[PDB]
Structure formats: C-alpha cells, structure tokens
Amino acid sequence: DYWYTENEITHLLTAQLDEKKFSVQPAITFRNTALTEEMLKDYTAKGEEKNKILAEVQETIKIANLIPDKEERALMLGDAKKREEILKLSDAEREKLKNDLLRGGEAQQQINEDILNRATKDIKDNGKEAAVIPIEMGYGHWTVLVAKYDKKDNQIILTFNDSLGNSINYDGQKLPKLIDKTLGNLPNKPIIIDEQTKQQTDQSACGVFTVDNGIKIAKGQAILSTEESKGEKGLRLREHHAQILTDAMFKQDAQWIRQQ
C-alpha cells in the first residue's frame, strides 16, 4: 500500500533514467531469516524426533495465542499452525517441500550473483555510466546499490544507501558477502562507498528514497541529507512519484497513494 514493490521502484527508475547511459537492474533480494539444520528438521525428522517437534508446535500454538500484540500474535500463530500442517504431511512430501525450499534459496543466490555480474558487464563492456540495483534486505526493506566503473584505473565502484540509517552491513554482512563472492576475484577489488545517510525511519519510506537515491547516485549528485529528509520530504517525493507514475501507469500511483 504505502510500501513500494519492486514494480514501482523499477518503473520510477526507468522513467527517470536515460537507458542509453544507465541500466536499471532487477532487484537483488535477500531473505531476512537464516536457514538452519534445526529448522529443516520440520521436514526431515521422523518417528520420535518428529513426535517431539509436533508436540512443541502444538504447545506454541497454545501460547502464541496469548501474545498481547495483535499483529505479532497473528504472525507467530499463523506460522505455528503452518508448521503443524507440515509436520502432519507424509515423510515423502515433507522431503519435497524441503527440496523446494533449498532449490529456491539456491536460485535466489545465483540470480543475485547474476544481477551483480550483469550490472558489472553493463558498465565495463556496454558503455553504461551507471548500473542501478534495487536491494531488498528483507520484506519491503528497500535499499539501493549503484555500480560505476573507472576505466582509467580499471576500478569498479559500488555506492550504497539505506534510508532507514543502517549501514551496508545490515543483517550479518549479507550484501558485502555477496559482493565479495561475486566480484572479489577482479583484478582490482570493488571499492565500496556507503553513504550511510539516515533519511527516514519509516519502513514505508524505503522505496521512496531508494528511487531518489538511486537516481541521484547514478547521476553523480548528492543524495538528500539527513537534514533535508526531515519533515514531509518523503511525502512530497511520494506525491511526485505518483505523478511520474500517473504520467504512464495509473494503478501504481493509486498503490503508492493508499494509507496502510
């Protein structure tokens, strides 16, 4: 509603960036939950180990019901109930479910690398002066990474910002780990510039500033400082974004307009 989806971010960026000079990449997305061997026992535990887990799930349901915050309660309870359903499946189906989960996670990390590499190919081989990559650090936690290339020094430079005021190391250095996995073998290590500019602490505003930061960084212009970001700037940007959207795609203007 208030929260931007990748669809708007991509359109807003494309609409405000010369495609001959700038390439807008599809989003790099990270899960915010870690996969653990213990979590997977929901799929692999059999016999008594399985019975013990089903037992704890059923107890959780009984307690999760009591969580005082209504929104938090619904989330924890819904997930416990889902877990109960999973534990009730056949061993064979729990196994397929686990494999689906692992397949998706593997796809996600390979696709994330491919986007970083494509962005790098764009600025290094295809004449683009910037590649803009929207980065989702978690559900709706939109941030931006802009890739540029100094040919004279054969040097890749990546510029990041998180409008909420987190560093690029947010959530266990997942993004720097990706960058180094993908590009840490280049003749010259990628230089990382973290703008670390807190702009607005509403998670609703992440997509608004992701767009504005990406555009500005792409063009070599200073992003909106903490000072300029105060007040109704997030609103004005959002209104402005709805106009740009309206000047083509009406349904996404209406989305950005909703309250939440």
Numbering used by the authors: 423 to 682
What does the paper say about this structure?
CE clan proteases, specific hydrolases for ubiquitin-like modifications (SUMO and NEDD8) in eukaryotes, reportedly serve as bacterial effector proteins with deSUMOylase, deubiquitinase, or, even, acetyltransferase activities. Here, we characterize bacterial CE protease activities, revealing K63-linkage-specific deubiquitinases in human pathogens, such as Salmonella, Escherichia, and Shigella, as well as ubiquitin/ubiquitin-like cross-reactive enzymes in Chlamydia, Rickettsia, and Xanthomonas. Five crystal structures, including ubiquitin/ubiquitin-like complexes, explain substrate specificities and redefine relationships across the CE clan. A comparison to the previously determined SENP2-SUMO2 and NEDP1∼NEDD8 complexes (Reverter and Lima, 2004, Reverter et al., 2005, Shen et al., 2005) revealed differences among bacterial CE DUBs in three variable regions (VRs) near the substrate binding (S1) site that were arranged around a structurally conserved helix (constant region, CR).
We determined high-resolution crystal structures of the CE clan effectors SseL, RickCE, and ChlaDUB1. To this, we added entirely uncharacterized CE clan proteins RickCE (Rickettsia bellii, GenBank: ABE04279.1), LegCE (Legionella pneumophila ssp. pneumophila, GenBank: AAU28953.1), and ShiCE (Shigella flexneri; GenBank: EGK20985.1). Interestingly, the remaining bacterial effectors SseL, ElaD, and ShiCE are Ub-specific proteases, and ChlaDUB1 and RickCE cleave both Ub- and, to a lesser extent, NEDD8-modified peptides. In bacterial examples, the analogous region is either disordered in the absence of substrate (SseL) or not part of the crystallized construct (RickCE). In fact, RickCE has an ∼75-residue insertion at this site that forms a helical arm in the crystal structure. Matching their specificity profiles, ChlaDUB1 and RickCE can both form covalent adducts with Ub and NEDD8 suicide probes. Deletion of the inserted VR-3 helix of ChlaDUB1 or the predicted VR-1 outside the crystallized boundaries of RickCE resulted in a total loss in recognition of the Ub/Ubl probes. The Ub/NEDD8 cross-reactive enzymes ChlaDUB1 and RickCE fall into their own clade.
